[PDB]
Swiss-Prot record:
Residues 8-54 form the SANT domain. This is Transcriptional adapter 2-alpha. Expressed in all tissues, but most abundantly in testis. Interacts with GCN5 and NR3C1. Associated with the P/CAF protein in the PCAF complex. Component of the PCAF complex, at least composed of TADA2L/ADA2, TADA3L/ADA3, TAF5L/PAF65-beta, TAF6L/PAF65-alpha, TAF10/TAFII30, TAF12/TAFII20, TAF9/TAFII31 and TRRAP. Component of the ADA2A-containing complex (ATAC), composed of KAT14, KAT2A, TADA2L, TADA3L, ZZ3, MBIP, WDR5, YEATS2, CCDC101 and DR1. Interacts with CCDC134. The gene is TADA2A. It comes from the Eukaryota. It is found in: Nucleus; Chromosome. Component of the ATAC complex, a complex with histone acetyltransferase activity on histones H3 and H4. Required for the function of some acidic activation domains, which activate transcription from a distant site. Binds double-stranded DNA. Binds dinucleosomes, probably at the linker region between neighboring nucleosomes. Plays a role in chromatin remodeling. May promote TP53/p53 'Lys-321' acetylation, leading to reduced TP53 stability and transcriptional activity. May also promote XRCC6 acetylation thus facilitating cell apoptosis in response to DNA damage.
């Protein structure tokens, strides 16, 4: 029950949405394909970050 209200001094609002879209457009594990719209960062960061907030206990 959350849209995605949480900024970051590193990532941006666009990156967040882009991360999901790619994750749903391509699929999980395809850090490579996802890097397409996430190019803004390293496929490695797109993963850790994802599991950070999305796959996290509390907003963060």
């Amino acid at each position: 029950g959350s849209s995605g209200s949480s900024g970051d001094p590193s990532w941006t609002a666009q990156e967040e949405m882009a991360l999901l879209e790619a994750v749903m457009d391509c699929g999980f594990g395809n850090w490579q394909d996802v890097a397409n719209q996430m190019c803004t960062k390293t496929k490695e960061e797109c993963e850790k970050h994802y599991m950070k907030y999305f796959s996290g206990p509390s907003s963060g």
